[PDB]
Write a protein that binds this ligand. Sequence first.
Ligand SMILES: Cc1cc2nc3c(=O)[nH]c(=O)nc-3n(C[C@H](O)[C@H](O)[C@H](O)COP(=O)(O)OP(=O)(O)OC[C@H]3O[C@@H](n4cnc5c(N)ncnc54)[C@H](O)[C@@H]3O)c2cc1C
Ligand SMILES: Cc1cc2nc3c(=O)[nH]c(=O)nc-3n(C[C@H](O)[C@H](O)[C@H](O)COP(=O)(O)OP(=O)(O)OC[C@H]3O[C@@H](n4cnc5c(N)ncnc54)[C@H](O)[C@@H]3O)c2cc1C
Ligand SMILES: [Mg+2]
Ligand SMILES: [Mg+2]
Ligand SMILES: [Mg+2]
Ligand SMILES: [Mg+2]
Ligand SMILES: [Mg+2]
Ligand SMILES: [Mg+2]
Ligand SMILES: [Mg+2]
Ligand SMILES: [Mg+2]
Ligand SMILES: [Mg+2]
Ligand SMILES: [Mg+2]
Lengths: 463, 470
Amino acid sequence: TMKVIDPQHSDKPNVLILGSGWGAISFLKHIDTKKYNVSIISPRSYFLFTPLLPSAPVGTVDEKSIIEPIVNFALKKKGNVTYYEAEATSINPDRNTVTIKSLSAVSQLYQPENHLGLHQAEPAEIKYDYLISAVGAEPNTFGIPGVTDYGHFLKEIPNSLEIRRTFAANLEKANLLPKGDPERRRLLSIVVVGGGPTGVEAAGELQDYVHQDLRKFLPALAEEVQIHLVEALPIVLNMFEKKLSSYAQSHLENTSIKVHLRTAVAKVEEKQLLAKTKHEDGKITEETIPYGTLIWATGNKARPVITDLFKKIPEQNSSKRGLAVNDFLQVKGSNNIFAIGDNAFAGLPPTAQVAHQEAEYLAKNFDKMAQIPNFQKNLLFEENNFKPFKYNDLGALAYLGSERAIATIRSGKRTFYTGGGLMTFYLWRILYLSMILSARSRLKVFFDWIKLAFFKRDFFKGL
Amino acid sequence: GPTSFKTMKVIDPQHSDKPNVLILGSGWGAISFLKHIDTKKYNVSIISPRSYFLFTPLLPSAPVGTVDEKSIIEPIVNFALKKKGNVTYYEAEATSINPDRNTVTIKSLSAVSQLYQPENHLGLHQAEPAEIKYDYLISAVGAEPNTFGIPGVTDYGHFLKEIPNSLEIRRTFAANLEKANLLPKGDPERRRLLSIVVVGGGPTGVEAAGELQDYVHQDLRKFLPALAEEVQIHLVEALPIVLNMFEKKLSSYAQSHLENTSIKVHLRTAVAKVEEKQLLAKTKHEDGKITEETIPYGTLIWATGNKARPVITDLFKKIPEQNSSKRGLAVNDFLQVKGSNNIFAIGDNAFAGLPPTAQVAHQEAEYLAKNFDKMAQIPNFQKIDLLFEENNFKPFKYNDLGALAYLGSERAIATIRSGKRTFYTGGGLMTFYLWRILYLSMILSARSRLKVFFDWIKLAFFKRDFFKGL
Ligand SMILES: Cc1cc2nc3c(=O)[nH]c(=O)nc-3n(C[C@H](O)[C@H](O)[C@H](O)COP(=O)(O)OP(=O)(O)OC[C@H]3O[C@@H](n4cnc5c(N)ncnc54)[C@H](O)[C@@H]3O)c2cc1C
Ligand SMILES: Cc1cc2nc3c(=O)[nH]c(=O)nc-3n(C[C@H](O)[C@H](O)[C@H](O)COP(=O)(O)OP(=O)(O)OC[C@H]3O[C@@H](n4cnc5c(N)ncnc54)[C@H](O)[C@@H]3O)c2cc1C
Ligand SMILES: [Mg+2]
Ligand SMILES: [Mg+2]
Ligand SMILES: [Mg+2]
Ligand SMILES: [Mg+2]
Ligand SMILES: [Mg+2]
Ligand SMILES: [Mg+2]
Ligand SMILES: [Mg+2]
Ligand SMILES: [Mg+2]
Ligand SMILES: [Mg+2]
Ligand SMILES: [Mg+2]
């Protein structure tokens, strides 16, 4: 016997959102809670502004500054929003329910607050009239041994804390060791795997901490740290014009970062890893790299609750990366479930930028559906001349450490800005600050950057 | 046996002629001292297991995010950087003070930071014991929370002394709110989970309760009004009045206000024992009779006095003049540990008849540092207790500057004075603004001061950050 939550107080349809990230929150911001009853299931009680996560480990920004509680977005809604802090473990399409487990809390932001009768660590099924799936994707080790055990992903707030604690602990042991000790040099050694903007910014941020703050009180130690940027492709930041990639690499190397291109990690052990380089000519070299801190910033794979769903919907069996959706962001094989963000595959890159646009688009569709009597009761999309989702690539930005960035801003076929440099770094800051989804988070990031102009970064081992 | 290889690494810097001053701790005493000590005349080293200074008077507002944990601490290294000479910081714990050989034993060594060029390799290892040699010792390790022998307080309650306590209190209460809200209204377990007991009617307990009541009334109530209405905060105090260091009328003003905010105050009440989900409170009434009440609670905050640390009580036994000590090291007019001519003690680890406050610790420190300025001009100092009388050093003289207490809901009481003169004494709205301005001014670092300021500004626009595990 499973507890089934199925709210039929009003005729408003029950919209059930999975997740509290870019897709789910952008959707929540735009959905009409006067026309729809909205519920959210996510094990993370806050929205995470991912593009600034790479600057959290070293305190360029603080962890709290870049997150925003779901409840704060929920308060600004006019209707009834319920937030289940729990994890969706099974999507059950044929009975229109989602199974949740690891239930920690339930928050009903409205008057009635009918007692639901759920208990922590007790399974349950939430019923829905529409499902919006946005659970994202999870880090992909690519089958490389040791990465889970010995490295750190850069995906969630706890990763920021773990990275800081590992590196801080390493600096402390290293400094006790005599200069010239290879163990000391290992402990001051950082490997970042992934040459996309995330890996690049992580390395640039760590290099900034070392050069700007650490060096103020432990210059010799700071001089010995070596940061390594490992990338499997022939260039870093390959979504950018090649000349910007070249600018970025030269700058990174100028800040003393070592870049290993055409290089892949073959295996990871506790104190060292094996890197193989596939040269242009075709030969393969390998290097054992001792490291103290390994940051794994690359690849993402479908979550288990999503790959399980693949098997329950015939049209979805051939899916591998994410849920196949139609022009309308409807999961194929379903007329009830929509998917947006990294958990959907529609040919688009996996970015917040795409997730945010899908969401705003879908929410607007939900405005139209609520004016068409048939949708409530009962192809409807084609018939009512809904327009397909159309992604508008607005561009890309990457911080490179030491107050330089690259950026390309566009819309449609028009490029409005494309280059790198000092001013580009100020643009990076302004643009990111303007993309943040909440006034509070925006103010906190702003205060963090102001403090940074006067004082060193907070780098507390365990705080 | 006498054949033992017993070998202990001993750090004895004899590079320069400057005397080695060794400071124990990184709190009010140690840091105020560090700020004033002349590092051109003296070589300074610091031993403390805490790598940062903690601005204690704002700790009670950390658990609920009125101010953030990071905002009220400042890394030792930041104070050390502003010094002109050589400062070394041992992140480790002093476990034995060895007066007859002028050394301090350290353990749990995590790190050593030498903020100067030579940086001679010392050859220490983590989790390896060592002894640091000194020409002068400044002991300021403070005091630790006292459970008074009451069973269960350590196991089931939370102290309010250090940053980790702030985190634990938040996590306990936040977890309780979540469980409580799943329970149906009227369930006694729900009512227990929303129940908070603060033991200690001094400014620390009062502010802790006031801050929690603020979080509940201002922020929690915004999104969970029914839950917020059900929380009950209890202030338990063994004396007949709260805040007994204040004028009695201010105490009465404070209690009435606390009770207005819905805090329940139990005076003349002492906790006899603490179990996991409940505690036993006994009230000794004026007439002489004793009543007892079992109080179910979800969160217990224990803010009542402290006691001497083990490394201090061990020292009691090694110095004949100090055997009769119980609360702290007995010092003379010059803050010299009696029975010693080498060791000075300031802060809560010393007993000189003064109250145990940051206010006293800070003044002892500035005073001692100034003495060290004088000693460095008198060739002979380079026995000692006489030199002080002889060279007409003045005894330490504490100047009580007053007291403040925040009471929740933007009210405070305060009495500001100097000597026999009272410059301010009362309570209310403006007193709360004074509380803020005065505390902001008392903070020891520009960084911490800016962060607290930003925290209070954010507070005017947004709810407090109350993350269960962050
Ligand atoms: C460090 C970093 C930096 C990035 N920088 C950029 C950038 O600069 N520009 C850009 O365009 N993109 C950037 N991205 C990519 C962007 O973050 C993702 O594409 C975006 O997260 C996709 O949005 P989403 O809603 O699909 O998933 P997410 O934002 O990851 O949200 C997923 C949500 O689902 C929740 N969840 C997980 N499992 C379950 C479950 N079983 N049940 C219910 N909920 C669950 C998660 O807790 C989370 O709340 C960055 C990503 C990272 C990691
Ligand atoms: C919550 C709270 C609020 C307070 N509010 C006020 C107030 O508003 N006004 C006021 O006047 N007073 C206040 N106080 C009291 C004030 O904080 C203390 O009197 C002050 O700490 C005494 O200074 P100290 O240097 O002796 O000890 P502390 O400031 O506590 O410093 C002790 C230092 O010693 C370190 N240490 C501990 N053990 C060892 C060891 N074995 N070896 C080396 N180092 C060690 C500790 O880490 C710490 O760094 C408050 C105290 C608390 C707990
Ligand atoms: Mg999402
Ligand atoms: Mg997110
Ligand atoms: Mg509302
Ligand atoms: Mg998704
Ligand atoms: Mg994702
Ligand atoms: Mg490691
Ligand atoms: Mg101290
Ligand atoms: Mg302190
Ligand atoms: Mg103390
Ligand atoms: Mg002391």
